[PDB]
Amino acid sequence: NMDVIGERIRRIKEEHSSTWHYDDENPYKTWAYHGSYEVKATGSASSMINGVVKLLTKPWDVVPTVTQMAMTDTTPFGQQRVFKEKVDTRTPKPMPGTRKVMEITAGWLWRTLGRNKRPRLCTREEFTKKVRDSARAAVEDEEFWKLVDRERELHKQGKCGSCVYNMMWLGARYLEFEALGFLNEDHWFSRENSYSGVEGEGLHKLGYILRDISKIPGGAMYADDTAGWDTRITEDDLHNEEKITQQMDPEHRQLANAIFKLTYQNKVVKVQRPTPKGTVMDIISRKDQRGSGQVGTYGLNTFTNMEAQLIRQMEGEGVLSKTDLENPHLLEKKITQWLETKGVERLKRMAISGDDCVVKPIDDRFANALLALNDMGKVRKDIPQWQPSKGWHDWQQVPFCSHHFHELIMKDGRKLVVPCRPQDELIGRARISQGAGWSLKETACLGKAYAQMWALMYFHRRDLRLASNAICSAVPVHWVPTSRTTWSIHAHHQWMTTEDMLTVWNRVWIEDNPWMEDKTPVTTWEDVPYLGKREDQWCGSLIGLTSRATWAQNILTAIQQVRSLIGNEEFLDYM
Ligand SMILES: [Zn+2]
Ligand SMILES: [Zn+2]
Known part of the structure; x- marks a missing residue:
């Protein structure tokens, strides 16, 4: 406790020895409180609107999902309400049998993950x-x-001495x-190395992977969300995640043990809190949960989710009973036999990206196999604890990484599998600029990046391809897209280039597409298919509405207004 975190608190206390005090009424229940000091507030209650894409997406000015996405709160107050919901909780300790099967599965999983690769600094x-x-x-x-x-x-x-965390x-x-970092840099959770992982694959490949999983015989496809995964990482999970150090060289194992013991299993966090005296930063600490702003948070979440879903598959197949999970003297034989004979096959039934998971078990007993999942602490979100899970018998309905995926039939007969999500989420995100004082050019370049991402990932949405062409028509051609649109793991950002969007499209969807055997290129956007009109409308399209038809037939007027304010540059007409 104080032997591991004492020096960190001392240096924070001595650097703010002025304005140092123990607030006797601190609002922390499961975190160990140490002290507080005062600083200036940081953040804002609203975000800047990207005027370029806003002026090119007028029908969505009157859309509630779009308007809400401009009101995020990172202020110290917003910092404190998210702390009450699930961060300031304690996860009950798993039962002794559950802890053994986790330890058995974690060691077997680490050996499998490290069968070809060796850890490195x-x-x-x-x-x-x-x-x-x-x-x-x-x-x-x-x-x-x-x-x-x-x-x-x-x-x-x-x-x-100084490894602290800031919420x-x-x-x-x-x-x-x-x-x-070797977990991410050396791609330990790629699908080739991990079977269940999808690290490095990209958003344009996740749908094909789900389609391949649907070919495996078994039950429905399940995709349960976990309520606050990072708060459900237990001390046993951290001990099981630490086993990777056994594969390291001594100088590497020493520095990784330090990270695990002094930074993960013990953590010092500074959080901002409003008070009737101003803005105050508090110093708290605990021994479990995972910090979200960490490297390897994605990889260690992926590993532990892989282990947990494997265990739920065990329980579904009858390998794990309630008595087994209660037993502090549980035998390893049948657990080890199952992992060594079926483990890799069962890993191939899953797509797992951190806390996001899709699994296709051998049958549907999995739906009611909830003893280990709940006892491990990974309680599902917004469902009674013991109510059976509902799966999908069509991979195209399965949610994964905030997306669903559609299989499309090109006019030449070839098949594409494209990512998709409710269109208001795409438009609402594109209308959000990141930060404060950015010039019109930087604001337009970010809008160009969203437009080209739509041309590459969401071309099949009629409203988005139109809006993408309008944004690209209103922004100078030679201007380079700035910043990032997605901030996500699965974004390869092939839209940041200024190469012809149709050329980049042919490279992503034909040339480099391993699920496309016919490499015949597409020569015109007219040969780039849309979703079915019914499917497009089901996923939020405004096609059929008169406000959309008016916006479409008068779109060049809005493009010229943006061009007039941008200045005298070189433009191209993409409509
Ligand atoms: Zn340190
Ligand atoms: Zn869709």
Whole structure:
């Protein structure tokens, strides 16, 4: 406890020895409270609207899903209400039999994941290349690595001085990246290496993967959401995730054990809180849960979700009974036999990206196999704890990574599998600019990035292809898209290029598409298919409405208004 986190609290206390106090009425119930100090508020209750795509998407000014997405709250008040919901809770300790099967499955899973790859340290040169107090992009060119070296020497002694978490210091995240970044950089959770994973595959491939899973004989496809996954990571999960250190070299194992013991299994967090005296940052700590702003959070969530779904498949097939989960002397024989004879096959029945999961069990007993899932702490969201799960018998209805996927028939007979989501979520996100003082050019370039992402991923939506062509017609051709649209893991960002969208389309969907055997290229957007009109409307299309027809037939007027305000540059007509 204080032996691991004491030095961190001391340095925070001495750096703010002025304005240091113990608020006797702190609102923390499951976190250990230490102290507080005052700082200026950070964040905002609303976000800036991207005027370029807003002016080109007038019918969606009157849409509630779009209007809501401009009111996110990152203020210290918003910081505190999200803390009450699920962060300030305790997850009950799993039963002794459940803890054994988790430990057996975790070790078997780590051996399988490391059958070809060996763990390795990540480097300052890697961290510096990936970025392309607190820190920005003046810091890697600064010799701030002397700070990193001094903290690493503390980690080599099993101590920690300045690795805290903010609901970050770049030095602590490098040290974490140095010891655990190999999971992401070496793609341990690619589908080839992990069977269930989808890391590096990309949003344009997830639908094909779900379609391949549907070919496996079995029951329905299940995709249960977990209520607050990061808050349900137990001390047993962290101990099971730590077993990867057994495959490391001694110098790597030492730095990773330091990350696990001093940064994951013990954590110091500074959180902002409103008070009748201003804005106050509090210093709390706990021994479980997972920090969301961490490298390897995705990989360790993926690993633990893989293990948990494997265990639920065990219970569905009758390998695990209630008596087994209660038994502190549970035998390993039938658990080990099942994993070594069926484990890889059962892993192939799943698509798992962090807490998002899709599994196709061998039959539908899985739907009512809930003893281990609930006892492990991964309680499903918005459903009675023991009510059976509802699965889908059509992979196209299965939700995964905030998407569903449609199989489309091109006019030449070839088949595409495209990602899709309710259209208001796509338009509402595109109308949101990130930050404060950005010029019209940077605002238009971000809108161009969303337009080209729609041309690559959501071309099959009539409203989006029209809006994408209007945005690209209103933004100068030579302007390069800035920032990122998705901020997500599955985004390969093939739309950031200024290559012809139809050329990039042919590369993504034909040339590089492993599920497309006919490499015959598409020569015109007219040969790029849409969703069925019924499906398009089911997923939020405004086609058929007169406000959409008026907007479509008068779209060049809105494009010219944006061009008039942008200035005298080179434009192209894409309509
Ligand atoms: Zn540290
Ligand atoms: Zn759809």
